[PDB]
Amino acid sequence: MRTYTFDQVEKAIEQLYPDFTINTIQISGKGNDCIAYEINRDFIFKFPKHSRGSTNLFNEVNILKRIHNKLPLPIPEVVFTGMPSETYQMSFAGFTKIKGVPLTPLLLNNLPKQSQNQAAKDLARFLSELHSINISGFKSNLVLDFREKINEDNKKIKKLLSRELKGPQMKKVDDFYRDILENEIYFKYYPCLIHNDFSSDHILFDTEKNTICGIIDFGDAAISDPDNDFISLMEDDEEYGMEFVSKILNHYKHKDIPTVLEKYRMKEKYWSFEKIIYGKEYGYMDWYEEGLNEIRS
Ligand SMILES: NCC1=CC[C@@H](N)[C@@H](O)O1
């Protein structure tokens, strides 16, 4: 997990774009993979915090570029690109800023039942279109082999929980990894392009028109189960309700909501194991302990 100063950032941009003038610069946000800088008022630059971050940055650029004018809501446009380095596919990248504020659940539930439904309608239209873009030209690296992932995780988990679990706990885990892997509902799906981190903080809203005016943060975008773009909004309190996601599902004409519900349940259980893995990948001891705790109950 590496760090940047403001001058390091200015320097990094100047050296590739010497004729770009930075008048103002502020940190607008930061996640696991990237720190984000608001440049002038018009641009968001992401700098990666590690190798994997950089790859996901690279992946965001290529995906934004290839869907640039293809969707019914605005989305970031790539304008500046950085360079490969030793272990980083992409030293930085610079995107247009999209006007709007996050469509928090709070902001959502304070909208009249009308503007609520329009937002649900508009989200279903964005998703339908995202999940319909033709996937044929996309390289294997831009897809998620989900069974390969669960197996990858399974191995990692054994390496890490060797010596943290009793054999009978470690077996309650084996049984979970096999209950999943012997269930085709998780893998028998029409893969398509997805946002894959589709959540209220990445949905921008125009309070003047009380309409959605943007979608951001395509770093995790990949070719995968279209259901994942609904499951990421279902969480109560943190995200929208279950009731609201049904509204979206129906404008979207999803023909099997109970399967979506089942995926959601699994996902929630599964998060303890991801916390463990990511806790170590990223160096979040707290995530690691939380994961360990939930597992022990
Ligand atoms: N359910 C917890 C949860 C899962 C997805 C994660 N990105 C987390 O932020 O919320």
UniProtKB/TrEMBL annotation:
ADP binds at residues 33-34, 46, 96, 98. Guanosine binds at residues 98, 217. InterPro entries: AGP_Transferase, Aminoglycoside_PTrfase, Kinase-like_dom_sf. Mg(2+) 1 binds at residues 202, 217. SUPFAM superfamilies: Protein kinase-like (PK-like). Residues 41-255 form the Aminoglycoside phosphotransferase domain. The keyword Metal-binding applies. Mg(2+) 2 binds at residues 217, 220. Adenosine binds at residues 96, 98, 217. GO terms for molecular function: metal ion binding; nucleotide binding. Keywords: Metal-binding, Nucleotide-binding. This is APH(2'')-Id. It comes from Enterococcus casseliflavus (Enterococcus flavescens). The lineage of its organism: Bacteria, Bacillati, Bacillota, Bacilli, Lactobacillales.
